[PDB]
Write a protein that binds this ligand. Structure first.
Ligand SMILES: CO[C@@H](C(=O)NCC(N)=O)[C@H](O)[C@@H](O)[C@H](O)/C=C/C(C)(C)C
Ligand SMILES: [Mn+2]
Ligand SMILES: [Mn+2]
Ligand code: NA
Length: 304
């Protein structure tokens, strides 16, 4: 394998962490390949669920607990902390909230969250690498409570970063927020990619095509598919009651990705940096409710 940049995996990984059996588990948790039979049963469908009141309440709770766990991870971001150490804290913070960490064994993903540094676009596997001053690192958290998943991520700076890191991260967060600002009933899912690509291209960045936002509720990934690039052909129109994520991945270089031999870590094929942000959204009559927002602070962590 020819690495595309300076990052390397740092092995061995710690043994898989158990979740106590008192925590309710999603269907894939005990499937030997991590497959989710409830997702597979819906595979080739474009139909979108209209959430009940009870469903909305379940989504509000799990998304609120997921933001609390991202904040725990945010507080740990400093030089010399390993991504494994972050994952261990996240795994304990999920169990403290009586939640299962949704990534753990999802299609055999081996950890409780994803930690993506620099050229990693997404799905990086927490490991023994200590964070370096100048890194950008994204932590992506998903929790499962009472049958509902809630998903969010932010990119953080490790100590002092360079101007290019600051622009990429800011522009990425602005792409997510301009897309959220357009959400309201009657809007097509395919329009959000136009908004995102327009702002990314104005700042000299590209938009990852291989990875997308998604419906989420009782399934971790379900309709709709939500591409982040322009002129995509995604199916569907927003309606009040729909819940989905928007999670754009924006890159310094070209948009092309490839995956490491571990089968999960997605990296820029040019080795340049990529950043991401994610929220879980509910469509409401006035626009949308950002279920994974912060409640006690105005800005994402990178701005403090
Ligand atoms: C971009 O990643 C998203 C995704 O795969 N989107 C669907 C798609 N087909 O591109 C995904 O939802 C992430 O947000 C989630 O945190 C990570 C989940 C794993 C347990 C699969 C690593
Ligand atoms: Mn996520
Ligand atoms: Mn997601
Ligand atoms: Na990255």
């Amino acid at each position: 394998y020819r690495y595309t940049g300076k990052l390397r995996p740092h092995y061995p990984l710690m043994p898989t962490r158990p979740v106590p059996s008192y925590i309710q588990r999603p269907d894939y948790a005990d499937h030997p390949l991590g497959m989710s039979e409830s997702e597979q049963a819906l595979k080739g469908t474009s139909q979108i669920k209209l959430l009940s009141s009870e469903d909305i309440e379940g989504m509000r709770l799990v998304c609120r607990l997921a933001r609390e766990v991202l904040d725990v991870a945010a507080g740990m971001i400093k030089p010399g902390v390993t991504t494994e150490e972050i994952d261990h804290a996240v795994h304990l913070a999920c169990i403290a909230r009586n939640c299962y960490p949704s990534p753990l064994n999802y299609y055999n993903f081996p950890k409780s969250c994803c930690t993506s540094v620099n050229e990693v676009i997404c799905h990086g596997i927490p490991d023994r690498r200590p964070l370096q001053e100048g890194d950008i690192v994204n932590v992506d958290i998903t929790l499962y409570r009472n049958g509902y998943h809630g998903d969010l991520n932010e990119t953080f700076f490790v100590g002092e970063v360079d101007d290019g890191a600051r622009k990429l991260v800011q522009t990425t967060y602005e792409c997510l927020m301009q897309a959220i600002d357009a959400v309201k009933p009657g809007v097509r899912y395919r329009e959000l990619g136009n908004i995102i690509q327009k702002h990314a291209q104005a700042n000299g960045f590209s938009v990852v095509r291989s990875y997308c936002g998604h419906g989420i509720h009782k399934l971790f990934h379900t309709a709709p598919n939500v591409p982040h690039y322009a002129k995509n052909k995604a199916v569907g129109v927003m309606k009040s009651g729909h819940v989905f994520t928007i999670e754009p991945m924006i890159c310094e270089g070209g948009w092309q990705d490839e995956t490491w031999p571990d089968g999960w870590t997605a990296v820029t094929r040019d080795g340049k940096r990529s950043a991401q942000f994610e929220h879980t959204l509910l469509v409401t009559d006035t626009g949308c409710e950002i279920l994974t927002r912060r409640l006690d602070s105005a800005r994402p962590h990178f701005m403090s």
